[PDB]
Structure formats: structure tokens, C-alpha cells
């Protein structure tokens, strides 16, 4: 806000001003892999890949 | 007080003197603004301006 001195303030009132800032977003981050059915007989690699992705 | 030396001191009596300091005021300090009634449909800027003024 601005300010002002004195008693008589006639025709010296100010207006308001409020400023702003924008926030935006980018592109998603992915881990994306493919796996055949027979490769899921042993599930350690799949789970470890999930943890390392996190 | 003054201080004086000797025995006689005749015709050398002093007077009394007390000094003064004056405190006064200044001009009033103001935040003064104008708004049309259409600007008060959303009054958030008005309240935030009041806070800024304080």
C-alpha cells in the first residue's frame, strides 16, 4: 500500500493494485517396460525393477 | 547551578534559571483509496489493501 500525509485529502485517493504469479507443469516421468508371461515364473526381477523405478 | 569562590560574595548573588523543551505533533498519516461499487463484488483485494495499509 502507499500512504499520504495531511488532513485534507480531497481528490487524492489512490486505486488498488494486486499482482500475481503463475505456476505451471511439465511432462510426466515414466518407467515403462514389457515382459512376456513365462518371464514371470520368477518374480524377483519384476519387483526389483519396480523398486528401482521408484 | 553556578558555583562561586571566596568569602565576601557581596553584590554577587545570582538568579534562578530553568530551561524548557517543547514537544509538538506532526501531520496525520493516511492510507486513502477509492473503489467503485462494481469492485466490491469480490472484496478480497479490499481486505488485503487494508492489511497492507496497517
Author numbering:
A (entry chain A), B (entry chain B): 55 to 108
Provide the authors' original text about this structure.
Salmonella typhimurium bacteriophage P22, a member of Podoviridae, is an established model system for studying protein assembly and conformational changes in macromolecular machines under different functional states. Approximately 250–300 copies of scaffolding protein gp8 and 415 copies of coat protein gp5 bind to each other to form the procapsid in the T = 7 laevo icosahedral arrangement. In addition to the conserved HK97 fold, gp5 has a distinctive nonconserved domain (insertion domain or I-domain) that is inserted in the A-domain. Here, we report the cryo-electron microscopy structures of procapsid, empty procapsid, empty mature capsid, and mature capsid of phage P22 at resolutions of 2.6 Å, 3.9 Å, 2.8 Å, and 3.0 Å, respectively.
